[PDB]
Design a protein around this nucleic acid. Sequence first.
DNA 1: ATTTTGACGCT
DNA 2: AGCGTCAAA
Length: 430
Amino acid sequence: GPHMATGQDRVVALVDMDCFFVQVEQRQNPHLRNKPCAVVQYKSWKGGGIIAVSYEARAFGVTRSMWADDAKKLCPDLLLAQVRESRGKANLTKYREASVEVMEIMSRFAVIERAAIDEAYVDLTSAVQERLQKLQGQPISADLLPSTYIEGLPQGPTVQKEGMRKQGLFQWLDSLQIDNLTSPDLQLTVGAVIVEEMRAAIERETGFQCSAGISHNKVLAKLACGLNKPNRQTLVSHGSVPQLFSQMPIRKIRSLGGKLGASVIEILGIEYMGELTQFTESQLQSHFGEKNGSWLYAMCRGIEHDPVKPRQLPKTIGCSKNFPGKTALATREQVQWWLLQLAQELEERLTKDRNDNDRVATQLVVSIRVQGDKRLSSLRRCCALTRYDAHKMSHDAFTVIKNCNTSGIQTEWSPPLTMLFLCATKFSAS
DNA sequence: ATTTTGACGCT
DNA sequence: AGCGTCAAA
Ligand SMILES: [Ca+2]
Ligand SMILES: [Mg+2]
Ligand SMILES: [Mg+2]
C-alpha cells in the first residue's frame, strides 16, 4: 500500500533512429529516398549481406541478414547502397559520424546514455520538472504531441491509424491532473512533449527520422519505442503495464531475448511477461539467481532501477574481420597482413578519438577464431597499448597469438584463422 | 558464408 | 584476466 514503491520516480526516454544506415545513405543519395532499399556489406558472395532495410523494402519481406541476391527475389526493384571498403574490409566510419551528429543534438536536451550506434536513453526527470514550472498549471494541448501514441488507448465505449492515435491521445489528455506537479502520468506527458521537441530537432538538423519510447525506466522506454515505429513515439504509463504485459512474450523484453528468457519460459511454464507476477521474489531468485530474480520480480510489475548512465562516447574502439570457408588464413604472411590492415584502421580511429575526446586507450585486446569452433571467439589475449602505431600494434597482436599455430612449419598457420579482432580498451584522460 | 560491431556479467 | 551473454546496424 502506502510503502509499495511503484517505480514512478523518473522519466526516461529511449530514442532509436529508423532504419538508420539506410537513412544515412538516403540523405547522401536522394535517388534512394522513398524507395525500397537496403544497405549491404560486400558484394561477391550472394550479392552481399543486408544489414539495414527501408520500410518500403520491409513491405516485400526483405530483412536483415538476408543475402542481397535473395532479397532481390522478394523485391526485384530493391535499391542497394554498399558499405565503404577500406584496407580490404567493411568500414563503418560514415555511420559512426552520423551517430555523433544525433548524439550531440540529443545531449543539448539532457544527459544521454549511448546504447548503440543509433540509440540513446535520456533521463528527462529534471527537464520535466523545469518544464512543469514553466507551464504554470497550463493544460497540455494535443498539438504539442503530434506524433505520440498512448499505449492502451483508446479504450471502452474512425477506422484509420491517425484517427485511432488521436482518439487515444484525446482520452489520455482529457483525464490528466495538470494541477498536480507530482503526478507521474503528468510527468510522463511533459516528457513526451520534450521528446517531440528533441525528435523535431534531430530531423531538422540532420534529416533523420526516429522513434522513441517514454516511460519510467529504460526497459519500458525501449519496449515502448518499438510499439509504433517508424517516425512515431509511444508513452507507456505505469497503469498500462498489466494489460501490455498480459500478452507480451517474455523474449520481447530487453535482456530476455536469449538463453535466460528461454529458461524463464521453460522452467516456469509461462509465455507472457505478466505471468511472472505469480511468483515470489525468492522463487525467481532460486531459479535465475539473486540479481536476475530481483530484477524479474520488479520488472514484471513495470519497475526497474537501472540508471541512465552519463556516457555519450563508446568505451571501446574495435576492428574485426571474418574469413569464412575457403578464405580462412592459412599462412603466416596472410595473418600478419590482415593484422596490419586491422591495426591501420584502428590507429586511424584511435588518433581521431584522441584528438576529439581527450583520451587515450591503454590496452589492446586481440581475439581470434580457429576453423572448427562454434563460439564467436576462440581465444582472447590482452597486451599493453602504449603507442598509436599500426605496425607496433599488429606486431604485438601477432606476438600474443603466434603460439596458437599448431603447425610444425613456421610458414604455415594451422588451424586456419576464421576471424581476427583488435579492440582498444581502458581509456584514460589525456 | 551474415558481418562488424559494442556493453556488461561471471568466476 | 579470459570467457560468455545479449544486443545493434
Ligand atoms: Ca534503429
Ligand atoms: Mg537501435
Ligand atoms: Mg533493427
